Write a protein that binds this ligand. Structure first.
Ligand SMILES: O=C(O)CNC(=O)C(=O)O
Ligand SMILES: [Mg+2]
Ligand code: NI
Ligand SMILES: [Zn+2]
Length: 331
């Protein structure tokens, strides 16, 4: 078995190897990459997502989110308070302000320590989940706006034609902005490109050990657990590396820098934070190996997680028994 310790793998494709997205994903899995839940891909040196970022300040962040924490430093929840619209130029200036900017630090490790010690005492503002793309239409390789769609994957593998579309999303981050512990909708893959700015640190649990993280989360967030059998789909719960180590949960960590891709694999729980002002683009995708994960994916039926138009069809076809109760939650 390849990669039996489930370490995060890093790949350096040539420009020749960068032409066929599906085939490269299948190559990474042949080497065991999926066992970690997360992989890094450094694009060939010849490749670029676009020519410059010089004219992005007029993108609108219609609903910036203030991420307010409750709990203790290593075990907390976050809620998202909606704020007034601002442009990316306005947001970048705010991120750079004395109130919100990255503190002095020695290296990524010292910054990680400061994040876990101090996150709960501040409320950073995240421009998340904005439909759109920063890839130039002429970028032909690994353009997250030109990928094969999950509806077309399901049709190719299973023969059924369904409604829905699949488009990318932009994320504008600042120091301390946080993504809570989750897997993707329907336990899909994700791919994330860091277009610009400061790094993003990731934590991940190997798919084969996901249930260990779920059991710890039920212990640590006991009222949330009683309210919903799939509450990590609410994307609100944080657990520190120290706490994970204390409870014997297998995990790994890595820092993504500007110009790098990350891939998350089906049922790979992940969480993380931004080091400073940055912009990432991400999209879900599928391969033939995902189908069985989609069939087994948990669902939120309490009504909090409230998800896309296109996830309807996935549930209807892959989970027809759940269909009914899940759409009661989504209506
Ligand atoms: O970048 C973020 O805030 C969150 N991204 C992801 O969870 C992802 O790409 O799967
Ligand atoms: Mg602009
Ligand atoms: Ni994700
Ligand atoms: Zn729920």
């Amino acid at each position: 078995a390849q990669n039996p310790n489930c370490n995060i793998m890093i790949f350096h494709p040539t420009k020749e190897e960068f032409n066929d997205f599906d085939k490269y994903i299948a190559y990474m899995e042949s080497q065991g990459a999926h066992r970690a839940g997360l992989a890094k891909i450094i694009p060939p040196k010849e490749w670029k997502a676009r020519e410059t970022y010089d004219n992005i300040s007029e993108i609108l962040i219609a609903t910036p989110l203030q991420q307010v924490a409750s709990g203790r430093a290593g075990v907390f929840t976050q809620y998202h308070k909606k704020k007034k619209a601002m442009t990316v130029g306005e947001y970048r200036h705010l991120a750079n302000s004395k109130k919100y900017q990255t503190p002095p630090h020695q290296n990524f490790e010292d910054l990680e320590r400061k994040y876990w010690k101090n996150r709960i005492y501040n409320s950073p503002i995240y421009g998340a989940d904005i439909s759109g793309s920063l890839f130039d239409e002429n970028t032909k390789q690994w353009n997250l706006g030109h990928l094969g769609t999950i509806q077309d994957l399901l049709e190719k593998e299973c023969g059924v034609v369904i409604e829905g579309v699949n488009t990318p999303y932009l994320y504008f981050g600042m120091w301390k902005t946080t993504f809570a512990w989750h897997t993707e909708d329907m336990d899909l893959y994700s791919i994330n490109y860091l277009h610009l700015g400061e790094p993003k640190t990731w934590y991940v649990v190997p798919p084969e050990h996901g249930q260990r993280l779920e059991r710890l989360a039920r212990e640590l967030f006991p009222g949330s657990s009683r309210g919903c059998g799939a509450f990590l789909r609410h994307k609100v719960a944080l657990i520190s590396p120290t706490v994970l180590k204390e409870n014997g949960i297998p995990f790994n960590r890595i820092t993504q820098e500007a110009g790098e891709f990350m891939v998350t694999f089906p049922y790979g729980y992940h969480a993380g934070f931004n080091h400073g002002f940055n912009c990432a683009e991400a999209i879900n995708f599928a391969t033939p190996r995902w189908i069985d994960y989609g069939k087994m994916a948990s669902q939120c039926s309490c009504g909090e997680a409230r998800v896309t138009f296109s996830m309807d069809a996935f549930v209807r076809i892959l989970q027809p028994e759940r269909y009914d109760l899940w759409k009661r939650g989504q209506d």
